[PDB]
Symmetry: D2
Subunit: 123 residues, 4 copies
């Protein structure tokens, strides 16, 4: 079923929970896990690589499976999921931008609206 | 992690895909799977029990684990998930009411907004 | 600008507020106001005509401007708005189905996603 | 009804349409119109004041009625709407960040979810 799982990580507490869920799902399904962190339109790259290092720490994936991407997060996630033929995307319901006002974060709404596979939302 | 999984089933093609995902997740995690179908505010009960029989067929769960509920679907799902201490809710992104116009069905939006655990959305 | 306004009415308290806003907007803009109420897939027709009579009471529109429609509410609203060349749709943020759980009701989400003109959301 | 209208402007084509609608609504209702532009967490201030100058150009409001705010746009808009006792908020359905993937932009979703008054969404 799930041979390749993609974790979208933003370093938020929701995303740290998602990382634990993604690691467990990969272990249960005998799947390859890829973690991605997008940085938006250097210092930005430094901070971003730090966030991605934490996702790699929490999930244990190899270096070629931890990717820094650029752009609107959801667009970057979807591109990587298509490129890596992900069978599941795991991401938080909300992130760093949460105010409790949206029903689901804007990047998770975008991914759920265009996802090429199931999406596991972690609160 | 996932010791109890709840599948919300409406008999839609999205929900039949979700049933396959839910069965696989239960097998992978060694989890107890519960399937629920809500009927809205008899003939209604007959049709509803038929839909639930199909969810039971597709997942193989025992009778006490296939439940007919009443009410706004999402409210019924959430009540059952709390009562059964579900660790994962699996449901389709859309259902019988799909027009392609919503970003996610209204029952899946409600469940994601108030879920007591992660939600796996199956397209 | 706004020569034709369409009010979507479901008889909810939000829709009664919307009716007052729609009447005021029509008066301010010198616009023709149409009110519509959709009934879903007789007794159903009786109840529906009652709800529409109340919208007509609250807005003062003539009979040919108060319409009963059938179908998924949002689809019916959008069809009428295109047919009547509405320049503004006025409707509540929520309705009879409100649980406080959605960010906006499912019929208002559908109309905002496909509207042929601006939409005035009344809380 | 509408004695004070607030226009949320981001300089997008949707927001230029919204500015025209807001100006017409203020003229029709004999209302005071306030325009606001939020800049996010200098050059940023320069660009932001330029965007706000365009909103002032398009609507004709006086200087004390054209405001630069800081923060998550929707939070800034809502704060200003409460402070100015707005009776209507006018804003686009989408903005500079549009990919066509969301049902409504994330700032418009936030404002509609917490608005202290009706919200007129301009496509
Ligand atoms: N830059 C990013 N890189 C990778 N994943 C991201 C990124 N941003 C968000 N995500 C994923 O999306 C999930 C949901 O967060 P999202 O950004 O949608 O909501 P938010 O930050 O609460 O609100 P906003 O819509 O203002 O961003 C995060 O938990 C994470 O899994
Ligand atoms: N009556 C129900 N009982 C159990 N699960 C349901 C029920 N209705 C919906 N669901 C679950 O919700 C999922 C998403 O469907 P949802 O009903 O949210 O969208 P829709 O039918 O496309 O639109 P609408 O918001 O008009 O119902 C379905 O695939 C199913 O998993
Ligand atoms: N049958 C209908 N006919 C005309 N307008 C309707 C109808 N149903 C809803 N509306 C319009 O949509 C507005 C928002 O209500 P909506 O039905 O979207 O939300 P809800 O009833 O709170 O939730 P649900 O998504 O469960 O219906 C109502 O205030 C009304 O203006
Ligand atoms: N910085 C801002 N200042 C004032 N109004 C804004 C600002 N950003 C957005 N808006 C208002 O919100 C409307 C809708 O745009 P919104 O920012 O919600 O969607 P988007 O830019 O398409 O997507 P994203 O959710 O990625 O921002 C804009 O047309 C404008 O009226
Ligand atoms: Mg975010
Ligand atoms: Mg449905
Ligand atoms: Mg309703
Ligand atoms: Mg419904
Ligand atoms: Mg924007
Ligand atoms: Mg954003």
């Amino acid at each position: 079923m799930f041979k390749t799982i993609l974790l979208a990580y933003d370093g938020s507490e929701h995303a740290r929970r998602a990382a634990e869920v993604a690691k467990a799902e990969a272990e249960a399904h005998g799947a390859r896990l890829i973690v991605v962190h997008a940085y938006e339109p250097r210092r930005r790259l430094e901070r971003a690589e730090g966030v991605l290092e934490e996702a790699r720490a929490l999930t244990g994936v190899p270096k070629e499976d931890a990717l820094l991407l650029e752009g609107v997060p959801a667009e970057a996630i979807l591109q990587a999921a298509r490129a890596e033929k992900a069978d599941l995307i795991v991401m938080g319901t909300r992130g760093l931008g949460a105010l409790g006002s949206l029903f689901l974060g804007s990047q998770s709404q975008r991914v759920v609206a265009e996802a090429p596979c199931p999406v596991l939302l972690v609160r």
